[PDB]
Amino acid sequence: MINREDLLKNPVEDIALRDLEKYSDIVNVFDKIYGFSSEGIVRGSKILKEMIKDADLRFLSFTANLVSTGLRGLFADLVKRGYFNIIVTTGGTIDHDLARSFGGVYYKGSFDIDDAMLKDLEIHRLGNVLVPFESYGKVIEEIVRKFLPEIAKDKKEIPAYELLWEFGKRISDSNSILRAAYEKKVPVIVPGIVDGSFGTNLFIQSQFLNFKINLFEDMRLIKDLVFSCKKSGALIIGGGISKHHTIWWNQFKDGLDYAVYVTTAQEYDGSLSGAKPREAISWNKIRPNAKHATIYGDATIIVPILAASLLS
Amino acid sequence: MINREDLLKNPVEDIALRDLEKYSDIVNVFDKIYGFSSEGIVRGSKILKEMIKDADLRFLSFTANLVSTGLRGLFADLVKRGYFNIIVTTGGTIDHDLARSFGGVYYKGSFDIDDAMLKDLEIHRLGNVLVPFESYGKVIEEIVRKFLPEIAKDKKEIPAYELLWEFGKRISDSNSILRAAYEKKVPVIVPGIVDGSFGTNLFIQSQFLNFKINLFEDMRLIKDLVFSCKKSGALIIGGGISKHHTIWWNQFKDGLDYAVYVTTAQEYDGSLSGAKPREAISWNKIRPNAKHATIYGDATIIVPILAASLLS
Amino acid sequence: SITYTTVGELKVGSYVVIDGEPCRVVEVTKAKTGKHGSAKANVVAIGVFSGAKKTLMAPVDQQVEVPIIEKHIGQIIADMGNKIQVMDLESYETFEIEKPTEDELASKIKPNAELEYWEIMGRRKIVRVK
Amino acid sequence: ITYTTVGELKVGSYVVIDGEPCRVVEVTKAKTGKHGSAKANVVAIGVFSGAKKTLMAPVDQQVEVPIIEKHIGQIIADMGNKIQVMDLESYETFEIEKPTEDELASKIKPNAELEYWEIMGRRKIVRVK
Ligand SMILES: NC(=O)c1ccc[n+]([C@@H]2O[C@H](COP(=O)([O-])OP(=O)(O)OC[C@H]3O[C@@H](n4cnc5c(N)ncnc54)[C@H](O)[C@@H]3O)[C@@H](O)[C@H]2O)c1
Ligand SMILES: NC(=O)c1ccc[n+]([C@@H]2O[C@H](COP(=O)([O-])OP(=O)(O)OC[C@H]3O[C@@H](n4cnc5c(N)ncnc54)[C@H](O)[C@@H]3O)[C@@H](O)[C@H]2O)c1
């Protein structure tokens, strides 16, 4: 056999923009090569830089699985340094950030290990990242049981974005996305908030507290920010509800003025996740004269490349 | 210049299980071929049959883009016939089923047609299905405006699944999923209900009505059904929030006893949408001795093959 | 009332307060699990007053409130109408209760009929007549 | 509680949102399409609470307007937190709360002439002479 302490040897390490500083010229390498994704990378890095300059509403929309990687600390850094000022994500992002902010350690694993051996050892596998049982569900359950009674006493019916600030308020991890968002008053819009460990534990405690969520207030906030901004931009990683919701609300201002999409899904199955910028013209969620770019690749490779370019 | 009525020539036509009776033996053809998807089709077909005999809780989980195709009529028929008695889906399923139930006609298009041209002609493109502007946003806005006052007067705070029944109660389309779910009292669980035209219109009318959604009640229903059932099965099409939410709640009963997954997503990017059933054995979300099958392919091809096999 | 127990201690037949109403537990189901947290139970119970099905999922160590039962024995004097007047065998006292509007009860009524009524949390309910 | 439509609202108009009369400070239009009909987002300040309230609705949606019922009066007592006012027309001396605003909390003195508006069942001071 292989014992637990062999598997959980090397924790996943969060990175920051500082780790990418010495590679800030790497886009020049792909510009020279110019193979099939280099145009998307070259145009994406330029669109990102222009978005930081000319867009006062800047979206960071991403799927949950990224937050189990070292990219979690990068997104906290990007929020801390003012690159993005609204987040649209999923309940899985809250689970991972809460678990890793309150002592839950994630460990480097492998795709080629026996998964049945993990269930015996009480380890979740996510990609090739190992999440011990007591590092994920135990932590989120403890945190919600501990802090919700005080939060619910203050406000019995609460928008989801305020609830996430309240939990961001109580985080001390400086690599935490929820902490970074709360420190900067950056709203975290999670329409599917009831999905996951955090949402399930909210529901469990709602049986004992006079506590409710009003997602109509999260809708009101994102609606108000979209209407009252001048230009809007987005870095949209992945597909699903967090991509659609970002694109959906920007339709009320004739679309995102700047957009960079990083995805692996393709278009032939008609999914929203794999829908090209030459798909949102029909849904008029992109301006008639706008700068949009799609890069097909793994986020843990493409995103550090794009983010390093921010320091060029 | 191309004219609108040239493009909106052939409406999308819903099918039902009737149309697949001729092809009820077709799995034998792929069994003989024993192509790469053939084992998943053969095994998935058997699991579906065993699921109907043996599982008292039977999930139908699917992404929204299918409800823009002729498959919408098929899912309504599978519910009316009792093959599945709980649905987990997304906010876009509500949009498409409400739009098409109240006179919104979807038309056959193509993947090529220039999208800037469609924006001029007030047409959305979804895959290769053309959705005229007046067929989608106008219809849903009128329908919510007309019926929410009476619904809100009866119940000022309502579960999402009860809201969808109230709209199913008012539909006359016999190809409608929401109508089928109402007739059978099959709950439709939509954690991300605020994401879409229906949810946006709910929010708009919530400004003028004492009306709120309590998604914690949707949570109680699916939790209660999972705990109180003997065995559970699921046909899961696509990934995203609807797949994860189905799998998440069955974890409380050791996992899904039967499951068939139809998806195009892959695993190398670590997403939930592309996670095999070999994955989620670490998430303790499938039984130690369970019959699960995954088929990779377009749902408009795989699902009619699997559904036809129900009649063999 | 409000005596306190844990969810894991509840079994079928026990009483528990759910959403403010005392309830009789009719089903208990356990989940060992661990991806969402500690071991949990799901109790299904029926409200003593409203008759509605109330459900509660919680960790087995979660604290819940139990109603305190008071099984008194009385007898009816008058009938008049909407309510009926009953006298407790001990602690001489006249009070009024509703017709149990179910059929198995409320069609057993007669003057000087001995009944057994339970008092929980500040309300009473008739059970048997004989 | 007179009525109008959202599209008729402009900056400076008055409208009831969440039950409170509000003064419109921003109106933003959105073109037609996927969401539905043409819509407007109005941003308004609560006259009493001072809170920012927003309403997004189709331009033809019916909304309620409060009626201002402006009056002019004078103060008799001082009473600290509460103030006893005499309406120039019709006497009807009544008690209200001091304006917590900076420019109005100063210039307060016995027999000071003020202008108070009466909207929906609650009065508010605006100026003082
Ligand atoms: N980390 C987890 O697996 C986890 C944990 C708890 C809850 N959840 C829930 O799962 C649900 C899934 O939601 P979703 O659809 O937004 O996310 P998803 O995982 O289903 O991904 C959807 C799309 O994002 C793209 N994508 C994902 N990761 C990518 C990457 N590294 N690089 C490039 N593209 C990538 C894929 O094209 C994929 O088709 C959420 O509701 C979440 O609450 C997930
Ligand atoms: N028709 C639309 O695309 C539409 C319309 C309105 C709202 N929305 C909203 O967008 C969000 C998207 O969430 P989602 O992830 O559930 O939808 P999605 O279309 O992004 O599907 C994601 C995954 O489903 C799978 N999939 C999609 N189509 C498939 C097919 N034909 N065959 C096999 N597999 C397929 C892919 O693996 C894909 O990665 C939802 O919240 C929804 O309410 C979508």
Side-chain angles (χ1 to χ4, degrees):
Chain A
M1 316 326 219
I2 198 137
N3 85 324
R4 215 155 186 263
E5 297 89 4
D6 288 336
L7 301 199
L8 322 163
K9 204 182 145 253
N10 304 120
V12 175
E13 306 159 66
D14 286 315
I15 65 165
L17 270 160
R18 312 346 292 181
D19 296 287
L20 313 174
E21 187 107 41
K22 65 185 287 196
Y23 316 109
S24 69
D25 283 305
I26 195 159
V27 167
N28 304 328
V29 164
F30 307 119
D31 205 352
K32 275 175 83 173
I33 291 164
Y34 213 81
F36 338 116
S37 305
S38 291
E39 182 189 33
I41 289 174
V42 169
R43 215 153 65 90
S45 80
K46 288 177 189 168
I47 291 173
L48 277 191
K49 268 164 184 134
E50 188 166 6
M51 173 195 319
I52 308 300
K53 282 200 333 281
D54 308 319
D56 47 315
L57 190 55
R58 299 182 300 288
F59 286 78
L60 180 59
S61 304
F62 51 104
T63 48
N65 51 318
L66 282 45
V67 193
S68 53
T69 70
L71 291 192
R72 176 206 175 228
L74 182 51
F75 291 166
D77 207 40
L78 289 173
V79 168
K80 273 189 213 163
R81 285 170 194 288
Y83 289 96
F84 306 94
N85 54 20
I86 173 157
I87 295 171
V88 191
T89 186
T90 61
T93 286
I94 319 306
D95 299 353
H96 289 313
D97 200 56
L98 279 187
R100 295 177 75 187
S101 297
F102 288 99
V105 184
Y106 286 17
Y107 291 98
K108 303 185 182 186
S110 176
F111 274 107
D112 47 298
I113 61 95
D114 206 293
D115 296 350
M117 174 93 274
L118 296 180
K119 184 199 226 223
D120 270 47
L121 287 154
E122 291 190 318
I123 288 165
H124 314 286
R125 180 170 73 63
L126 191 52
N128 42 3
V129 165
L130 273 36
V131 188
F133 274 29
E134 65 274 13
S135 298
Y136 183 82
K138 207 215 183 298
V139 176
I140 301 164
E141 178 183 36
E142 280 166 349
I143 291 321
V144 175
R145 214 203 288 224
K146 193 175 174 191
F147 294 133
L148 202 60
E150 338 174 343
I151 295 158
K153 255 127 54 179
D154 208 53
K155 203 160 171 193
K156 54 166 172 332
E157 173 164 326
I158 197 177
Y161 70 83
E162 296 195 358
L163 178 66
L164 294 173
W165 282 335
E166 290 294 342
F167 280 90
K169 198 202 282 294
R170 297 157 174 83
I171 287 183
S172 171
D173 188 350
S174 60
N175 288 299
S176 161
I177 290 169
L178 292 189
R179 175 65 191 199
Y182 142 84
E183 278 175 18
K184 309 287 299 199
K185 284 301 255 210
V186 163
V188 186
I189 308 292
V190 186
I193 185 96
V194 306
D195 187 46
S197 205
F198 178 74
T200 303
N201 280 112
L202 279 186
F203 156 68
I204 292 176
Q205 300 304 141
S206 86
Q207 302 165 123
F208 307 101
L209 316 166
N210 183 24
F211 175 76
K212 296 179 176 161
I213 301 291
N214 193 6
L215 292 169
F216 290 158
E217 283 301 319
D218 301 68
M219 289 316 86
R220 193 165 80 73
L221 177 51
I222 180 154
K223 177 261 294 175
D224 283 339
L225 291 169
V226 160
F227 267 91
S228 76
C229 75
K230 295 294 147 242
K231 292 177 144 184
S232 64
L235 169 66
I236 299 187
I237 300 143
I241 184 162
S242 58
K243 160 182 206 204
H244 169 82
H245 205 68
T246 305
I247 296 186
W248 166 265
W249 276 112
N250 277 277
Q251 95 188 43
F252 294 90
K253 61 170 281 304
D254 206 19
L256 288 154
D257 300 279
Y258 312 93
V260 186
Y261 312 90
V262 189
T263 181
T264 53
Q266 296 289 335
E267 188 159 31
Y268 94 91
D269 53 287
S271 63
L272 176 126
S273 303
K276 278 211 287 164
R278 189 177 57 87
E279 154 81 318
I281 298 183
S282 75
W283 290 81
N284 313 18
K285 302 141 175 35
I286 151 242
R287 299 261 196 185
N289 200 255
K291 332 214 170 42
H292 291 224
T294 302
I295 304 153
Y296 294 103
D298 181 4
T300 58
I301 290 172
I302 297 295
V303 173
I305 289 182
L306 292 170
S309 96
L310 291 179
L311 320 165
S312 94
Chain B
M1 156 174 146
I2 235 298
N3 199 21
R4 210 168 182 262
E5 302 71 34
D6 306 328
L7 296 175
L8 319 178
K9 195 176 86 177
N10 301 125
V12 180
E13 252 155 45
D14 288 313
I15 74 173
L17 217 43
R18 50 137 164 141
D19 302 287
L20 312 177
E21 253 154 32
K22 269 185 62 171
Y23 318 105
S24 70
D25 280 329
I26 202 188
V27 161
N28 302 338
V29 171
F30 306 121
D31 201 359
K32 263 165 96 52
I33 293 165
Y34 215 72
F36 329 91
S37 303
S38 292
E39 180 195 23
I41 287 188
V42 167
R43 252 174 74 238
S45 184
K46 296 168 184 169
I47 288 154
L48 283 188
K49 264 163 195 134
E50 186 166 12
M51 200 206 287
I52 313 272
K53 281 174 253 133
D54 219 54
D56 48 311
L57 190 57
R58 297 179 302 282
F59 286 85
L60 184 57
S61 311
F62 52 99
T63 51
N65 54 317
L66 320 175
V67 197
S68 70
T69 68
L71 284 186
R72 162 189 181 253
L74 183 62
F75 289 156
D77 210 42
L78 297 176
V79 173
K80 289 185 212 186
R81 284 174 188 236
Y83 289 100
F84 304 94
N85 56 14
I86 173 168
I87 290 157
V88 192
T89 197
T90 59
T93 288
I94 315 310
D95 301 354
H96 290 318
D97 196 59
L98 276 190
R100 300 176 68 181
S101 297
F102 290 98
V105 184
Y106 287 24
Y107 290 93
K108 299 179 176 191
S110 79
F111 264 105
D112 277 45
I113 283 167
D114 196 58
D115 289 354
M117 144 178 43
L118 294 170
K119 170 192 186 76
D120 260 39
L121 305 153
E122 283 165 313
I123 291 171
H124 324 101
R125 187 200 38 110
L126 211 173
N128 50 351
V129 164
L130 302 177
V131 188
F133 277 24
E134 66 274 19
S135 297
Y136 184 79
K138 191 198 185 254
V139 176
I140 298 165
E141 174 183 62
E142 289 164 341
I143 280 310
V144 180
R145 223 168 148 174
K146 182 169 172 202
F147 292 127
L148 203 54
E150 347 170 358
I151 295 163
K153 156 182 226 153
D154 257 34
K155 205 148 177 192
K156 58 173 153 193
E157 159 162 294
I158 197 173
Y161 68 87
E162 283 191 7
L163 187 69
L164 303 185
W165 280 338
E166 290 291 347
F167 279 94
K169 193 198 222 198
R170 295 157 168 78
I171 287 177
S172 162
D173 193 347
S174 51
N175 287 303
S176 146
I177 298 165
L178 292 183
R179 174 73 195 188
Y182 163 78
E183 284 179 6
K184 310 295 299 193
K185 277 324 218 216
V186 166
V188 184
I189 304 297
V190 187
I193 181 86
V194 301
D195 185 49
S197 186
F198 178 73
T200 303
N201 281 278
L202 280 187
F203 156 66
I204 287 166
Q205 303 301 320
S206 84
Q207 299 169 128
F208 313 89
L209 308 169
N210 175 15
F211 175 79
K212 315 212 170 165
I213 296 280
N214 186 1
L215 283 174
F216 291 152
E217 281 304 320
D218 296 80
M219 285 313 87
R220 202 166 64 79
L221 181 49
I222 184 165
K223 179 263 298 177
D224 281 343
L225 290 162
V226 160
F227 270 95
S228 93
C229 79
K230 303 175 299 251
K231 291 221 223 164
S232 67
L235 180 64
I236 312 187
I237 299 144
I241 177 157
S242 65
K243 167 186 182 185
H244 173 268
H245 205 62
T246 305
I247 295 183
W248 169 267
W249 277 112
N250 276 272
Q251 93 190 257
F252 296 88
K253 61 165 286 305
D254 186 282
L256 281 157
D257 301 282
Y258 313 94
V260 188
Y261 312 83
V262 186
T263 182
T264 58
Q266 42 289 306
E267 189 167 317
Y268 87 99
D269 55 288
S271 61
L272 146 111
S273 302
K276 270 272 280 273
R278 177 62 73 192
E279 188 155 359
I281 197 42
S282 74
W283 307 341
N284 60 260
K285 271 146 169 71
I286 84 223
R287 295 252 189 196
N289 292 36
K291 350 208 181 186
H292 297 225
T294 300
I295 307 148
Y296 298 102
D298 199 2
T300 66
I301 312 287
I302 302 302
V303 182
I305 289 163
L306 285 175
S309 94
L310 292 179
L311 309 162
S312 45
Chain C
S1 287
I2 202 166
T3 168
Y4 292 87
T5 192
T6 66
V7 165
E9 282 172 34
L10 294 165
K11 199 162 187 196
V12 193
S14 331
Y15 286 86
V16 62
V17 168
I18 302 186
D19 271 284
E21 189 188 349
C23 302
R24 175 186 106 260
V25 177
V26 308
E27 190 199 296
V28 170
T29 319
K30 309 215 136 173
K32 320 150 305 182
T33 57
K35 185 154 169 207
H36 48 87
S38 53
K40 283 166 185 71
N42 192 56
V43 320
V44 183
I46 295 269
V48 160
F49 308 167
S50 72
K53 197 190 253 53
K54 309 279 217 173
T55 57
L56 187 91
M57 180 202 32
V60 277
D61 59 57
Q62 177 95 27
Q63 161 179 131
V64 291
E65 313 152 26
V66 182
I68 314 192
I69 73 280
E70 266 171 38
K71 43 166 230 185
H72 299 156
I73 314 102
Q75 201 152 330
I76 162 164
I77 292 97
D79 274 85
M80 31 152 270
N82 205 339
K83 308 193 188 61
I84 57 143
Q85 297 137 240
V86 159
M87 203 84 90
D88 190 14
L89 261 278
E90 300 271 317
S91 186
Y92 37 99
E93 191 258 320
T94 297
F95 62 113
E96 300 177 348
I97 321 97
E98 304 285 325
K99 249 94 150 169
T101 179
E102 61 156 25
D103 217 330
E104 302 297 329
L105 300 185
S107 60
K108 199 78 78 161
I109 29 84
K110 45 110 169 165
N112 305 84
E114 51 207 326
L115 42 77
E116 173 205 75
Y117 68 94
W118 294 60
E119 162 51 86
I120 45 191
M121 312 209 338
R123 276 158 275 203
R124 301 181 167 111
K125 176 175 182 201
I126 311 294
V127 185
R128 50 159 277 200
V129 175
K130 172 70 177 164
Chain D
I1 194 155
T2 162
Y3 300 85
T4 171
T5 70
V6 169
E8 281 169 68
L9 287 172
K10 26 198 163 153
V11 183
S13 332
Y14 284 51
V15 63
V16 175
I17 305 174
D18 283 87
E20 188 189 349
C22 299
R23 199 209 335 131
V24 174
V25 309
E26 229 173 45
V27 176
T28 318
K29 308 287 201 208
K31 266 159 244 153
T32 188
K34 340 83 175 178
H35 42 271
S37 57
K39 284 152 181 69
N41 191 46
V42 313
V43 187
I45 308 289
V47 152
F48 306 142
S49 73
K52 209 149 163 246
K53 299 214 175 296
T54 53
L55 196 88
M56 209 252 288
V59 281
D60 53 51
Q61 178 87 52
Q62 270 248 335
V63 285
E64 333 168 326
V65 178
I67 183 54
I68 298 299
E69 202 100 357
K70 333 170 90 138
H71 301 128
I72 322 194
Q74 207 165 283
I75 163 72
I76 49 170
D78 272 325
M79 169 54 216
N81 71 121
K82 270 176 300 312
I83 255 68
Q84 214 159 6
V85 181
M86 199 137 184
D87 195 14
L88 292 205
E89 222 85 80
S90 188
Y91 194 127
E92 202 35 45
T93 278
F94 56 95
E95 292 96 355
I96 62 95
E97 317 302 58
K98 250 167 176 142
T100 42
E101 208 255 14
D102 185 278
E103 204 141 332
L104 301 189
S106 48
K107 289 172 198 68
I108 176 58
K109 48 189 117 61
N111 310 328
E113 31 206 47
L114 70 74
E115 185 184 347
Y116 69 95
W117 295 7
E118 165 45 355
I119 323 100
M120 290 209 73
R122 276 167 67 87
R123 307 189 208 253
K124 148 149 192 263
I125 311 192
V126 186
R127 292 177 72 201
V128 144
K129 295 178 290 171

